[PDB]
Every structure is written in structure tokens, then in C-alpha cells.
Amino acid sequence: NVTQAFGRRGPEQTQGNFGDQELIRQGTDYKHWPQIAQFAPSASAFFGMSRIGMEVTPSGTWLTYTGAIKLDDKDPNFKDQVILLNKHIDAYKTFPPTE
Amino acid sequence: AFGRRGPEQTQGNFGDQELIRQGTDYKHWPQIAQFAPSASAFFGMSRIGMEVTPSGTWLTYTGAIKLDDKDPNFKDQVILLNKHIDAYKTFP
């Protein structure tokens, strides 16, 4: 359960925005998870390519990170990959309301 | 492998002269690598976006990992991370 582990999907800076109802429920058991997970950076990549900061606040000490991964357009599955990613990005905006 | 360390949005800023030269053979690499998020964490915790430019299609990401207070090595860990963050500013 992704929301139990990493909190609810929403627009706030402190929230994650990635995941549709199927992914949030099935976590890493999701049908297409491996096709998503391939874009997650290795430790080398994460510290190599990212903008890393350290911020101290009431809540504690945070390791901030920013970057962007260039998707390989020469990859045969590129068209399917962008669709799968686009599907889960801000997917919370399509979730039926609670009330 | 990952380009020069600098202040530009397109550059990485993490790494001192020893890490940039020794890569994953660096003495304390394993103690750094432990903070890198798993795939689950990366897509769970991060703000993911998609931008299209001349160069191609980019997967943007933002987030922050809270370090562990309880962790015995906490004080050493923050020093090691602080050492490599914007370390390029001390390259004389």
C-alpha cells in the first residue's frame, strides 16, 4: 500500500504525486512496476546527476534532491514508456471524491 | 561519467575531489550510497514531472529524505554528506 508507506498522493510540496489507484493498492506487485522501476536511478546515478542539499527544520534534518532523467527516444518501447509514466503522474486528479 | 560539479540546474553539485576520481571505489562510498532511494522510495516520495524540449523527453524529480536521529552514526553521516555537498566551491 503506497499511500500507507509514502503518504497520500496530492499537490503539496511534501506529498508524492506519482501513482494511479491500481499502483497505490498493488505497490511493487503492480503489472507494469518493472517498466516504471527501470527509470529509478541507481545510488551512483542519484548522487552523480542530482542537485543534493541538506536543510535543518523543526521536523528534523532532510537530504533534498532535484534532477531530471533523459528518456532514450531511440528505445523501441519509448512511446509505451512515456504513456505509462504520464498515466501515473498526477493520476490523483482523476480519483473520485470521498464526499 | 556525470559531468563537472557546478551551480547550474543541469549540473550535479555532490562530490569532493577524492569521490569524483575514485567513483564507487571511494573509501566511504557504501556509507553515502545507503541514502540513495530504492525504486519504490524514488517514485513513492518524489514529485515526478515530464518536460519535452528540443533535446528530447525528460523525467523531472524533486523530494527530500529525512535522516535518522536515533541512528548511532548520525553525527558522522551528516558530516560525510555535508563534506561532498557543494564541495566544488572549495576546489582552489
Curated annotation (Swiss-Prot), chain A:
Residue ranges, annotated region (Putative NLRP3 binding): 1-72
Protein's cellular compartments: Virion; Host cytoplasm; Secreted; Host extracellular space
Modifications made to the protein after synthesis: ADP-ribosylated. The ADP-ribosylation is retained in the virion during infection.
Domain CoV N CTD: 1-96
Region (Dimerization): 1-93
Family: Belongs to the betacoronavirus nucleocapsid protein family.
Functional description taken from the UniProt entry: Packages the positive strand viral genome RNA into a helical ribonucleocapsid (RNP) and plays a fundamental role during virion assembly through its interactions with the viral genome and membrane protein M. Plays an important role in enhancing the efficiency of subgenomic viral RNA transcription as well as viral replication. Attenuates the stress granules formation by reducing host G3BP1 access to host mRNAs under stress conditions. May block host chemokine function in vivo, facilitating viral replication and transmission. Acts by being secreted into the extracellular space where it competes to host chemokines for binding to host glycosaminoglycans (GAG).
Subunit and partners: Homodimer, homotetramer, homooligomer with RNA. Both monomeric and oligomeric forms interact with RNA. Interacts with protein M. Interacts with protein E. Interacts with NSP3; this interaction serves to tether the genome to the newly translated replicase-transcriptase complex at a very early stage of infection. Interacts with host NLRP3 and ABHD8; these interactions disrupt the association between NLRP3 and ABHD8, increasing NLRP3 stability, ultimately leading to increased inflammasome activation.
Name by which UniProt lists this protein: Nucleoprotein
Organism per entry: Severe acute respiratory syndrome coronavirus 2 (2019-nCoV)
Gene from which this protein is expressed: N
Span of the entire protein shown here: 269 to 367 of 419
From Swiss-Prot, chain B:
Organism whose genome encodes this protein: Severe acute respiratory syndrome coronavirus 2
Record keywords, A-Z: Acetylation, ADP-ribosylation, Host cytoplasm, Phosphoprotein, Ribonucleoprotein, RNA-binding, Secreted, Transcription, Transcription regulation, Viral nucleoprotein, Virion
Gene Ontology CC terms, in alphabetical order: cytoplasm; extracellular region; host cell endoplasmic reticulum-Golgi intermediate compartment; host cell Golgi apparatus; host cell perinuclear region of cytoplasm; host extracellular space; intracellular membraneless organelle; MHC class I protein complex
Chain ranges of the CoV N CTD domain: 1-92
Compartmental location: Virion; Host cytoplasm; Secreted; Host extracellular space
GO BP annotation list: induction of platelet aggregation in another organism; negative regulation of interferon-beta production; positive regulation of NLRP3 inflammasome complex assembly; response to host immune response; viral RNA genome packaging
Protein family (similarity comment): Belongs to the betacoronavirus nucleocapsid protein family.
The protein's role, per its UniProt record: Packages the positive strand viral genome RNA into a helical ribonucleocapsid (RNP) and plays a fundamental role during virion assembly through its interactions with the viral genome and membrane protein M. Plays an important role in enhancing the efficiency of subgenomic viral RNA transcription as well as viral replication. Attenuates the stress granules formation by reducing host G3BP1 access to host mRNAs under stress conditions.
Name used for this protein in its record: Nucleoprotein
Molecular-function GO term, any one: protein homodimerization activity
Subunit and interaction comment: Homodimer, homotetramer, homooligomer with RNA. Both monomeric and oligomeric forms interact with RNA. Interacts with protein M. Interacts with protein E. Interacts with NSP3; this interaction serves to tether the genome to the newly translated replicase-transcriptase complex at a very early stage of infection. Interacts with host NLRP3 and ABHD8; these interactions disrupt the association between NLRP3 and ABHD8, increasing NLRP3 stability, ultimately leading to increased inflammasome activation.
Record note on modification: ADP-ribosylated. The ADP-ribosylation is retained in the virion during infection.
Keyword Transcription carried by entry: yes
Superkingdom assignment: Viruses
Main location: virion
